[PDB]
Motif scaffolding. Structure first.
Motif, mmCIF file in Angstrom:
data_model
loop_
_atom_site.group_PDB
_atom_site.id
_atom_site.type_symbol
_atom_site.label_atom_id
_atom_site.label_comp_id
_atom_site.label_asym_id
_atom_site.label_seq_id
_atom_site.Cartn_x
_atom_site.Cartn_y
_atom_site.Cartn_z
ATOM 1 N N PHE A 158 0.806 -1.189 0.000
ATOM 2 C CA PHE A 158 0.000 0.000 0.000
ATOM 3 C C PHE A 158 0.854 1.261 0.000
ATOM 4 N N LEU A 159 1.810 1.358 0.906
ATOM 5 C CA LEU A 159 2.619 2.565 0.956
ATOM 6 C C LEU A 159 3.400 2.817 -0.310
ATOM 7 N N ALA A 160 3.918 1.770 -0.922
ATOM 8 C CA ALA A 160 4.749 1.959 -2.104
ATOM 9 C C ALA A 160 3.908 2.537 -3.239
ATOM 10 N N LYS A 161 2.675 2.046 -3.348
ATOM 11 C CA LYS A 161 1.729 2.543 -4.347
ATOM 12 C C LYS A 161 1.248 3.961 -4.009
ATOM 13 N N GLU A 162 0.883 4.221 -2.760
ATOM 14 C CA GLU A 162 0.358 5.539 -2.407
ATOM 15 C C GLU A 162 1.362 6.655 -2.461
ATOM 16 N N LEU A 163 2.624 6.347 -2.176
ATOM 17 C CA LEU A 163 3.687 7.327 -2.308
ATOM 18 C C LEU A 163 4.279 7.384 -3.712
ATOM 19 N N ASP A 164 3.690 6.660 -4.651
ATOM 20 C CA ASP A 164 4.091 6.742 -6.056
ATOM 21 C C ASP A 164 5.572 6.386 -6.249
ATOM 22 N N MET A 165 6.014 5.289 -5.642
ATOM 23 C CA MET A 165 7.428 4.967 -5.608
ATOM 24 C C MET A 165 7.831 4.354 -6.907
ATOM 25 N N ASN A 204 -3.977 -0.051 10.363
ATOM 26 C CA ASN A 204 -3.519 0.453 11.670
ATOM 27 C C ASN A 204 -2.008 0.737 11.684
ATOM 28 N N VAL A 205 -1.232 -0.177 11.103
ATOM 29 C CA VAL A 205 0.225 -0.033 11.075
ATOM 30 C C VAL A 205 0.629 1.120 10.211
ATOM 31 N N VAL A 206 -0.031 1.299 9.090
ATOM 32 C CA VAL A 206 0.274 2.432 8.218
ATOM 33 C C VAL A 206 -0.002 3.755 8.887
ATOM 34 N N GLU A 207 -1.093 3.842 9.655
ATOM 35 C CA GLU A 207 -1.384 5.078 10.398
ATOM 36 C C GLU A 207 -0.263 5.422 11.338
ATOM 37 N N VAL A 208 0.253 4.442 12.064
ATOM 38 C CA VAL A 208 1.365 4.725 12.981
ATOM 39 C C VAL A 208 2.616 5.145 12.216
ATOM 40 N N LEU A 209 2.927 4.431 11.137
ATOM 41 C CA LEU A 209 4.092 4.765 10.330
ATOM 42 C C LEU A 209 4.032 6.177 9.711
ATOM 43 N N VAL A 224 -0.161 9.986 4.190
ATOM 44 C CA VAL A 224 -0.938 8.891 3.612
ATOM 45 C C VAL A 224 -2.224 8.562 4.356
ATOM 46 N N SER A 225 -3.316 8.659 3.633
ATOM 47 C CA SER A 225 -4.604 8.229 4.130
ATOM 48 C C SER A 225 -4.698 6.704 3.969
ATOM 49 N N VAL A 226 -5.236 6.039 4.977
ATOM 50 C CA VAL A 226 -5.587 4.620 4.843
ATOM 51 C C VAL A 226 -6.986 4.302 4.317
ATOM 52 N N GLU A 227 -7.765 5.333 3.984
ATOM 53 C CA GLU A 227 -9.130 5.106 3.538
ATOM 54 C C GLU A 227 -9.234 4.226 2.294
#
Lengths: 227, 228, 226, 221, 227
Positions: free
Chosen positions: C31-38, C185-190, C198-201
């Motif tokens: 998720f993070l790699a995609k949302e941050l456009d890596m 939950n983990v992404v919110e903390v990170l 980054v929104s987790v929605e």
């Protein structure tokens, strides 16, 4: 990993009959070594051959051995070995045969046909067209399509690649049992090919007994194959 | 552990059709080698390939072989090999193709759909965007998402990483039987791509027979896949 | 036996989310790699990784890959690898991170609870007391006793041994299914820890679908674990 | 293949309690390390140890660790790796001229008794006499498998003073009571005053928390 | 490197090997002889591939593969049944040692599984060359003509003979299915004659029932490992 303990025999005719289908090559090669009164001249030595001596005529012998007389070498194995070890042994055999400028490399094998015939035949294949023509000259049918597994298949290819004259003789057989009759057919062709006069009558006479004494070995071999 | 016995063919077009889903690539590559009248030019040699010769037209042949005519090489395998060995072979193939400055590396593969279609299609994927554009220029659809396992997947990636132009053509197929018709679809696209003059009619003509003769091989292959 | 193909990234923040319990770290890191456009910036190369390419957006990609943007690296794996190979990869990762003087090494992992909770929490553990204090300053509870297996456990230890600042974030989860909600939950903390936006929605919105598309992978993974 | 990360401790008394029958040595060694307030001073490092950290008091820890030195393992390792580790341990102990090498182990009896005993064995007759000089019975005949057996022999062969203490136990279950028996003897041997009452008090709870580990271990055996 | 022999030189050694095998015939015989001749522990085999253990014997830790010694005699004992490659590696180091010290004799004690009960179980012999066969015949031992000897005994017979040493195997017929201290006693009697020793086998026959019981698990262990 594998060492051949084997003196040089210049211009060797090397005959291989390792265990395979019907034990055709195995019976043929053992019969020839005995009938031509060969000496034990060497063996294969490897930590990966399980620890054993066979006793033959009150002499300890290793399970992978070479018999010899004059320019002929016969290679015999009493255990059916795993594929990588077969390849390693084939590679050392071919290096040896290159080194001594072997004249011929002849494998004796079986071909499982899956049903009974009144007359089981013998097929041949050569490592190049020249060897095919030699075989045709002796009235042996050339196998056109199929596969040869195990030491016989590997030697045919590797020996030919090294520029040696290579052949396989294949005795048709049921596929399911030790077949001394097929072995006898192969020996008769080998006789013609090498100008030997070895009678196969003793082989045909004891066919029932040989079939019985080797039935366990055949069973062993089939179990090991299907791994 | 693996040696390629293979003469240098400068600017080779290398086509790979190792066993895989539907035996699509295997059928296609064997068909092409025969139809283009190729010679046997080399083989893969390894202690880890089990001992055998195949006899083809009264000549002994090893189970992993390369056929050649002019600038084209076709790679065939008659056994389905374990993953580490496939990686080792792919590595030697790529070193060879680097060395000779191969013009193209093309894998022929199958893509298991999991059901019947009246018209099975052929997809393509390129090792970079440039190859994708070439494929699009031929009217081949680009696979956007999925996975390509085995030799074909590895070569696509490793060849591209060596700066070679790499492609996979994927014939849609059921997924669980030999499919000479999918093979034929792939050969038709390859013909267009390379400007060859191969008819697939002889393949379609023997489809039923090929499906039968390869049904054990397919069975073998699926068993080996489940272990690995 | 393993090579990292990975350019040097100066002051790297290295985030690892290899497959593990709940696939919590796996979902989070993807998720993070995609949302941050890596971008894809590197990969792990080894003869012991089985032969494949994954096709993603019409590009072939290897199964063990590194994504990058600015000073952040994310490490992802699509296959659950055997233990010795995990150790070999960890060792090359730590050598890299030593080499580039990484600022942070953060593993994203799951913690199997063995039952349903209405509110699954996130725990933290640091490689030294300093990192524990950072996590406490963010309101993350410190795990006092337990075990962390796999890449996340190995990295926590080896990276801290190498003098790097090391952390694991652990999302509580059932223990036996893919859990995108724990991942969220983990992404919110990170996000809080790294000051990201980054929104987790979008993760919560596709939770059901993700659970379904990964159910095989989870099955695969549990099989391999024994 | 195995590296010891372990500073030199001159004239070390080295106590080994790796997993084994009843987890007797494991419970004993863990108890002692905690009761004597030991620091973590090193670990065993190998690619063949599976990847993990254990979290203890909010600190990450490797599964084969050293805390007098006490050696602990939270995993039951295969035989070849046990041999490799024993060899590095003995090289280390040679190097630092260790004073004593003491293994804590269990002996499976196969039935219940009201009073389970502790046996001893020494690497030479001198160590047997030390053990006898207190009321430790010398094992005359039998088998000691695993790390404890290997260390006894290899440490002796390197000229070190070696011992094994063996707590009789059922054979079938984690046995903190046998562990407590072993700790009491080790107390006498090293002149320590560690009370085993906290161990006996938590015997049930320990038996429960380790029941899976014991199951794991027997499967691997 | 993989196997090390820790064993002082004994010049002109008579080396007797009784590793576990069928009936535990060799194992019982060798253990009995080591004890009855009051032998010291003089060495051992050391390898990372031997699983970690000490055996405690008379309050002394001892390794599972050991050599006992007195005067010119060495007896080799193993309490574990080892895999084939490791047996080969150990045989190789044994033979190097025996070459080095110019061993006078290499004698393996083994069993031969008959598969049924006999009122009088016999002992067979085989020598590494015809000279050793003639020695055995001179003692009234029947020479095995055909068969196989697996394990350490088979390997030593062959490898020692190849190194130019005098090698023998004595084989006590036995049921094949159980520890056989009676067969062991038969073998010891022949070894007595061969080496000019006077070791009474009565204590062995007297405890036959007890030995059979104490070793029944070991025999079970061994048969499991054999496949």
């Amino acid at each position: 990993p594998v060492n051949l303990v084997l003196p040089e025999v210049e211009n060797a005719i090397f005959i291989e009959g390792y265990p395979g289908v019907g034990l055709v090559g195995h019976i043929a090669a053992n019969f020839l070594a005995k009938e031509l009164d060969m000496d034990l001249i060497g063996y294969v030595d490897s930590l990966f051959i399980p620890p054993m001596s066979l006793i033959l005529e009150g002499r300890p012998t290793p399970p992978l051995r070479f018999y010899g007389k004059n320019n002929i070498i016969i290679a015999i194995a009493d255990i059916f070995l795993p594929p990588t070890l077969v390849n390693e042994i084939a590679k050392e055999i071919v290096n040896y045969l290159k080194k001594v400028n072997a004249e011929k490399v002849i494998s004796l094998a079986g071909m499982g046909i899956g049903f009974f015939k009144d007359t089981f035949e013998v097929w041949g294949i050569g490592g190049s067209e020249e060897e095919n023509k030699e075989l045709e000259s002796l009235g042996v049918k050339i196998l056109k399509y199929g596969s040869i597994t195990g030491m016989s298949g590997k030697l045919l290819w590797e020996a030919s690649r090294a520029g040696l004259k290579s052949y396989v003789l294949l005795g048709e057989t049921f596929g399911d049992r030790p077949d001394p009759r097929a072995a006898a057919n192969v020996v008769e062709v080998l006789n013609k090919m090498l100008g030997l006069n070895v009678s196969v009558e003793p082989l045909l006479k004891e066919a029932e007994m040989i079939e019985e004494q080797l039935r366990r070995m055949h069973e062993q071999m089939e179990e090991a194959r299907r791994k």
